[PDB]
């Protein structure tokens, strides 16, 4: 396999470490424990992620409305 | 409505040991 | 290696249309956006937008809306931008830059700028 | 938005001396610990250059004479030793938000 990089401003599939999801990547403003690997909200979808190589904390923002 | 996506992000942790 | 070229300069008169090219090599033209500068001398850097090549989805900025109009070739993979009716104040030199996104999104390369005169 | 602001417009640093030029933001750019900024060399004919990245960082090829630091709005850029190639046009960039804004730019004089 081969590595991709990030488009931020678009909506694109999500595979990291085996998590798969779609959505935005966008600024995170939430601090997060580095012992973490990611984070969910009440709805059981993911509404962040950590990138495996460098460390950065990056927002979910869902897409396909309507 | 529905959005498709387009591209693919695909990101793995940088490989120590394989 | 990733090289931007553009042309030297173009002369345009008022009411016309204007034709930029901005060609990329190096690397795959869809997967990375495609950003515009606009810097006119004396007033500084200004941004002009940013259009994604493969759904041709484009980013304007408020001060530009209904003026430029951004898109994309895929075959040659060449950008283009393009001005409705350029006036006296539209003279300036305008860069094609690509961002590597690591975190924050910054402009690795830029291209070699063309200046636009509008004159008669 | 967020507009940037750099004062003082026009700088002059001798050899041996510290440059520091001050890129303020509307909002807080800062996040996940980090900061968003950037900061760029434009020499006349020559398109600009990254040097600088996210103030914790050297860009590779760029000389160590170029150092940055600051959290927050306001942020400081300094440069030692001074040599007599850093004359240029200096700015700053935010890609948090969008629109993203550009800085005012600052020249820089060389004493001689």
């Known amino acids: 396999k081969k590595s991709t990089n990030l488009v931020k401003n678009k909506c694109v599939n999500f595979n990291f470490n085996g998590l798969k999801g779609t959505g935005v990547l966008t600024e995170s403003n939430k601090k997060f424990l580095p012992f973490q690997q990611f984070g969910r909200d009440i709805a059981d979808t993911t509404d962040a992620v950590r990138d495996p190589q460098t460390l950065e904390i990056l927002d979910i923002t869902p897409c396909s409305f309507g | 409505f529905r959005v498709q996506p387009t591209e693919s992000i695909v990101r793995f942790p940088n490989i120590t040991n394989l | 290696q990733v090289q931007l070229q553009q042309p030297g300069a173009e002369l345009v008169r008022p009411g016309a249309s204007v034709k930029l090219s901005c060609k990329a090599s190096?690397?795959?033209?869809?997967?990375?956006?495609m950003n515009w500068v606009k810097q006119r001398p004396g007033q500084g850097l200004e941004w002009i937008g940013m259009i994604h090549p493969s759904d041709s989805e484009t980013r304007l900025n408020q001060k530009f809306k209904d003026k430029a109009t951004l898109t994309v070739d895929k075959s040659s993979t060449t950008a283009y931008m393009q001005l409705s009716s350029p006036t006296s104040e539209d003279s300036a030199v305008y860069y094609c830059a690509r961002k590597d996104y690591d975190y924050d999104a910054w402009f690795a390369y830029w291209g070699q700028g063309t200046l636009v005169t509008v004159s008669a | 938005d967020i507009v940037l602001t750099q004062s003082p417009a026009s700088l002059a640093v001798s050899l041996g001396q510290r440059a520091t030029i001050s890129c303020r933001a509307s909002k807080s750019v800062s996040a996940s610990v980090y900061s968003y900024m950037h900061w760029y060399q434009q020499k006349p004919g020559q398109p600009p250059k990254l040097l600088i990245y996210?103030?914790?960082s050297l860009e590779s090829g760029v000389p160590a004479r170029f150092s940055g630091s600051g959290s927050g709005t306001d942020f400081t850029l300094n440069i030692h030793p001074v040599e007599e190639e850093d004359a240029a046009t200096y700015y700053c960039?935010?890609?948090?938000?969008?629109?993203?804004?550009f800085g005012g730019g600052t020249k820089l004089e060389i004493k001689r």
């Open positions: 190096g690397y795959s033209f869809t997967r990375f956006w």
């Open positions: 996210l103030a914790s």
């Open positions: 960039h935010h890609s948090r938000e969008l629109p993203p804004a």
